[PDB]
Amino acid sequence: MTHLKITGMTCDSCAAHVKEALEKVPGVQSALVSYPKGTAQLAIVPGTSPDALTAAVAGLGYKATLADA
Numbered sequence: 694m695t696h697l698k699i700t701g702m703t704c705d706s707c708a709a710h711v712k713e714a715l716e717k718v719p720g721v722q723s724a725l726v727s728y729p730k731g732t733a734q735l736a737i738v739p740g741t742s743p744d745a746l747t748a749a750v751a752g753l754g755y756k757a758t759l760a761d762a
Contacts, residue, residue: 694761695743697733701756704728711750711757718746732762 699708708726711733715724720741726733735746743759750757 695735695737696759696761697735697743697747697750698758698760699726699731699733699750699755700758701754704731707755708733710753711755714749714753715746718749730762732760 699711702708702711705728708728712724712726715721715726715733715735718737718741720738722736722738724733724735726735737743737746747757747759
């Protein structure tokens with residue numbers, strides 16, 4: 694369910710700030726981003742919202758999406 698898609702950026706160092714921004718959110722449990730996939734497998738507490746993280750990344754100058762793969 695909780696999968697996010699990376700857009701706008703490329704990968705790796707881009708995914709690092711994404712993961713950092715995710716962990717900056719106190720609702721995160723375990724954010725593991727797959728740079729070679731272009732997707733993020735972030736586990737969060739039942740209080741945060743995936744659209745909020747997507748908007749967070751999109752509002753960080755990057756682009757996020759969401760697709761469970």
